[PDB]
Amino acid sequence: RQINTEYAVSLLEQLKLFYEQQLFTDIVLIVEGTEFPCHKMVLATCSSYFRAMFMSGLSESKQTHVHLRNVDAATLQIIITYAYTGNLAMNDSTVEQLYETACFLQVEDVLQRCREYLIKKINAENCVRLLSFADLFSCEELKQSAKRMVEHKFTAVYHQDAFMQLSHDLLIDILSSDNLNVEKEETVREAAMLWLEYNTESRSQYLSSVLSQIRIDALSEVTQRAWFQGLPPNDKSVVVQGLYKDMPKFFKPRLGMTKEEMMIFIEASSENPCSLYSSVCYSPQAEKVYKLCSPPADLHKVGTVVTPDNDIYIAGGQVPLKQTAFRTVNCFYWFDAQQNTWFPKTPMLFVRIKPSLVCCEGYIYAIGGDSVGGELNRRTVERYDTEKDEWTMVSPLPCAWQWSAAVVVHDCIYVMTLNLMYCYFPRSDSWVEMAMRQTSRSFASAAAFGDKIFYIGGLGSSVTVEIYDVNKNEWKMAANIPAKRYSDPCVRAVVISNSLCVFMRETHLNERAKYVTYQYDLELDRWSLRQHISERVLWDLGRDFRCTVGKLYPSCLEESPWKP
Amino acid sequence: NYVVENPSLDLEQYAASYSGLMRIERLQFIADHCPTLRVEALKMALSFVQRTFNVDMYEEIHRKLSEATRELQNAPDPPALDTAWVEATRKKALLKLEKLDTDLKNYKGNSIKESIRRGHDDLGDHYLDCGDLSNALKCYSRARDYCTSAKHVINMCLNVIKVSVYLQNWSHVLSYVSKAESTPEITQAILTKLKCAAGLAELAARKYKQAAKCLLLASFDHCDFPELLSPSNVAIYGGLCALATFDRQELQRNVISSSSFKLFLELEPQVRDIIFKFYESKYASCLKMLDEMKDNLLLDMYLAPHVRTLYTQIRNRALIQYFSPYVSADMHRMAAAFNTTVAALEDELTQLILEGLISARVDSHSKILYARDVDQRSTTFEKSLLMGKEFQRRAKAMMLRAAVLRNQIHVK
Amino acid sequence: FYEQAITTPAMAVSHIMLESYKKYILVSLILLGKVQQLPKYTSQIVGRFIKPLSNAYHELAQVYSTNNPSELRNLVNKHSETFTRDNNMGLVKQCLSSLYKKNIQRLTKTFLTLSLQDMASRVQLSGPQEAEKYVLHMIEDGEIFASINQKDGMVSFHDNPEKYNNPAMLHNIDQEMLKCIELDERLKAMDQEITVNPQFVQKSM
């Protein structure tokens, strides 16, 4: 266990009193002309450098004035007070110098805290800076976790200025890695070319190594004469060298070109009765069913969103409290497309049940979702910031709605309910009244294809389809999906292969559920049979399962072993 | 299911006979299942739950008592928990527990197995008093490691048995009963306590034949055993299970030979008469006492679901034995051998014949139950002819299989 | 015959096989009152695929096991179109009649003398006349050994009057004996033909 806490607090606050009131100070730190009167005890408890500074036997053992150099006054003051009061106020700016002084003074505890701060602060705009920082100081855990987030993010942006100022060893590890996420192998080629041409002949010796990590499908085509233009004059040790050099190193395709348009399913019927629900996916091209990681702490009643950058997020949901037992939590998670795991993120402010997650302008919008408040503003609409990793409230929606769906069209949020629709204008944070539907239908989903909204189904569900045009602002009927009579189809609207397809599972009387998808002809207003899902690969999923459009890697994921 | 209305329970004796968390569980279920008496049952429960610093179940019981008092304020047209207890109870409970924890952790730095085991048992006892089941188990599951002597193993088994009853982990009870019995070479009657725990656990696990056998071996010298089950209910538990499973000669031997169940039957004269009437073929008085025993003991903890099955078995067994020494048994007289009607007995008899073990035919004309004594030879010949026909059919099937396999006949 | 068709080894399930399995269930419900278990010399995936496919007939058997003509009739009405693609609906009616006959037969094993009014109440008939007709028809078919007393409205059931002392049983046993001897002669001939094969001799030599 521990020891007496009531005296632990008394001594702690009294040492703080003896620090603010400078009485029992035998050693003072001289940093850039700033006096830091303190004790040898407190500096010893935190830092592992002062233990080699005082109890070492050097000249400073008896000297009462030490001139600590290559440090910062603010960083020293916060470190000293942290050793004195433990309140480590970590902002978003001074953490860089905080780690520098923590490593210099070898203070293990603050090193772990700032590493825990940086493991949460890793994002898009500082991935390169943190990796270089993680390369400068040995922080392998941060270095590896950065590298993974770095690997995906460089491929996406590949335009940050700190990428040019990187060590040769770091670049070789980044480029030769098999975790890059690229639609083509040519974007990494030009990224290396611009990095090599960024500086003078100091990149010439590294050019013999950077090309040794890139595949040979581009080491004989264009971007070889371009280097000859940029070659130092009369250098005959490079042009001939690269002429006969690209024989070895085993051309092999990378892993980033292995993303296929797949239908991600959540809360599917668990195969083993020991678990409540599971998550699976259907492959429209591979015609197989790949398993997915379980929702975080079997998070049920959640919502899914896929950003244009192909990122999966989970918000809302409830966990069974420790027979009916369920408690709602506002936890937020992010799915790793390669590690097959859900990385936790900043939680929301209010708990939600079945929230509608919609992405727009890089912000994740969660509209409604049976909030816990229940006050006059029983909607609690709030967006998420993907660069600052925080949540910001938005303009409340006019009318309280339940069991609603939302889509994004023309950089605007379009949320749909039983019969009403309101469009949110993110630039002014306002809501405008939209067209009114003539049919009262709920418990349905909508897919945003182009500049039109397709509300498919509604109430089991039915085959009613009401097409809404943003430019026309009107709801019109197109047709009804031809399905077997005396059945209860489960419609799922989704956009795939630049076309509006439907994932409709139908069940007949005294018969098992049948899976089949149809391709809706936009100009002909007819659902055509695109593909029939055989039951030998896909089993029953349930009723409360959700579907979304996204891309996943079949290599990182594993096939689900289950009998037809 | 249960939660029926019926008067005349003596709350004072049933509460005082037991003691501990077992008593707390008994007072709660009695209040929850016996209306028109829940208030005093809850009032006595909360008055005892506040003792020994309970935390979570107190809130549940106080809320139930508050609801019960509110109900009493509207029928003949809620007590305060005194939350100063919360401040008082928590502050005392923490300080003594932290003091005890400090001692044990220091003893863990002293490395003495028995002291670690004894301290962990003390921590488990405190956690059970605090209302922390799993917390006590881990303390008890760390005392199991540091055992030194046979008595230490016996104490370890008893503690796990006690906790797993509250946890309803009866598998852990039975495993530790077997460990405590079979290991140490099968005045201090220690095996009697183990047998009592096993019988109660088996009965709660929907077992009657072995539970009665274990309960019959329980000696009355155990006397005070309130942490698991009072002797009054033990006698009732043994008697009902014995009546349902043990046959006549099986009943007579076991009750008499044990000589401790005779003392148990002295404690509960009602079941003693029931068994005696069962022996003397007076099932009319036997079952009318049984129905009187039904209401008084259907608000019991581990009995209420099982007693209905036990009583149903008793009714079936009584009918089977009654008709056994009868050739032309008048259904009127058999109906007169109970408070049942002629039609109800006929339906009960018909059900018994359909299930079996009565071997009878009902003559509804004169309402006389005639026993069936079929000739062995006729049935033997009939089933032998049926067997021969089935053998010929299977031989034809096998010959056809051989024909289709030899000629290589199969769907491509 | 249906059982033999079921046990045919087949790498692919066919409609003819599927319907043979469905007809097998119907006859089993009529004759034995339950679905006879498939043997263990068995077959191929025919067994694997048909059972999920012929789910409705298993549902009919399940309710048949519950032994409730009223509930069975309600299920038949619920699944009327489910059994219609059989080219025959009389078998379902024959199943209901067999259930009534089975209930009457079960009454004989439990009653020696039962009234028509009580018999009709137990098997849920419209009146004593229907029970009287049903008993008469079953006695005509040789399924029941009983007697009805219209004076008191009673039906007196009786056991098998066969004491196995008549020459008819001996003659039947001798006929089964002749069938068994012909069976054994055919088995010996097939065993000899097996012995003629090359493989067994090669293993023996």
Curated annotation (Swiss-Prot), chain A:
- Record-annotated BACK domain positions: 127-223
Pfam families under this entry?
BACK, BTB, Kelch_1
* One Gene Ontology MF term: ubiquitin-like ligase-substrate adaptor activity
Q: Where are the Kelch repeats?
A: 311-362, 363-411, 413-451, 452-495, 501-547
Which domain of life, per UniProt?
Eukaryota
Arranged from A to Z, the UniProt key words for this protein are: Kelch repeat, Phosphoprotein, Repeat, Ubl conjugation pathway
Domain BTB, residue spans: 25-92
Instruction: Spell out the protein name for this chain.
Output: Kelch repeat and BTB domain-containing protein 2
The record's gene field reads KBTBD2
UniProtKB/Swiss-Prot annotation, chain B:
Note the SUPFAM superfamilies from the entry.
Winged helix' DNA-binding domain (SSF46785)
Keyword set, alphabetical order: Cytoplasm, Nucleus, Phosphoprotein, Signalosome
Give the UniProt subcellular location, in the record's own words.
Answer: Cytoplasm; Nucleus
Pfam families with a match to the protein in the record? CSN1_C, PCI, RPN7
InterPro entries this protein is in? Answer: CSN1_C, PCI_dom, Rpn7/CSN1, Rpn7_N, WH_DNA-bd_sf
Major localisation: cytoplasm
What Gene3D superfamilies does the record point to?
1.25.40.570
Tissue expression as described in the entry:
Widely expressed.
Q: How does it assemble?
A: Component of the CSN complex, composed of COPS1/GPS1, COPS2, COPS3, COPS4, COPS5, COPS6, COPS7 (COPS7A or COPS7B), COPS8 and COPS9 isoform 1. In the complex, it probably interacts directly with COPS2, COPS3, COPS4 and COPS5. Interacts directly with inositol kinase ITPK1. Interacts with CAPN8. Interacts with USP48. Interacts with ASB4; this interaction negatively regulates GPS1.
Query: What is stated about domains?
Result: The PCI domain is necessary and sufficient for the interactions with other CSN subunits of the complex. Mediates the interaction with CAPN8. The N-terminal part (1-216), which is not required for deneddylating activity and CSN complex formation, is nevertheless essential for other aspects of CSN complex function, such as repression of c-fos/FOS expression.
Regarding protein family, the annotation reads:
Belongs to the CSN1 family.
| Name under which the protein is recorded | COP9 signalosome complex subunit 1
From Swiss-Prot, chain C:
Q: Which residues form the signal peptide?
A: none
- Tissues/organs with expression: Widely expressed. Expressed at high level in heart and skeletal muscle.
The portion of the full protein included here is 204 to 408 of 423
User: What function does this protein fulfil?
Assistant: Component of the COP9 signalosome complex (CSN), a complex involved in various cellular and developmental processes. The CSN complex is an essential regulator of the ubiquitin (Ubl) conjugation pathway by mediating the deneddylation of the cullin subunits of SCF-type E3 ligase complexes, leading to decrease the Ubl ligase activity of SCF-type complexes such as SCF, CSA or DDB2. The complex is also involved in phosphorylation of p53/TP53, c-jun/JUN, IkappaBalpha/NFKBIA, ITPK1 and IRF8/ICSBP, possibly via its association with CK2 and PKD kinases.
* Highest taxon above the source species: Eukaryota
Name of the featured protein: COP9 signalosome complex subunit 3
Organism taxonomic ancestry = Eukaryota, Metazoa, Chordata, Craniata, Vertebrata
**Intracellular or extracellular location(s):** Cytoplasm; Nucleus
This protein's assembly is summarised as: Component of the CSN complex, composed of COPS1/GPS1, COPS2, COPS3, COPS4, COPS5, COPS6, COPS7 (COPS7A or COPS7B), COPS8 and COPS9 isoform 1. In the complex, it probably interacts directly with COPS1, COPS4, COPS8 and COPS9 isoform 1. Interacts with CK2 and PKD. Interacts with the translation initiation factor EIF3S6 and IKBKG. Interacts with ERCC6.
What protein family is recorded?
Belongs to the CSN3 family.
Q: What else is known?
A: Amplified and overexpressed in some osteosarcomas (OS), suggesting that it may participate in TP53 degradation in OS.
Q: Give the organism the record lists.
A: Homo sapiens
Which intervals hold domain PCI? 1-162
Q: What gene is this protein translated from?
A: COPS3
- On this chain, the residues bearing Phosphoserine are S204
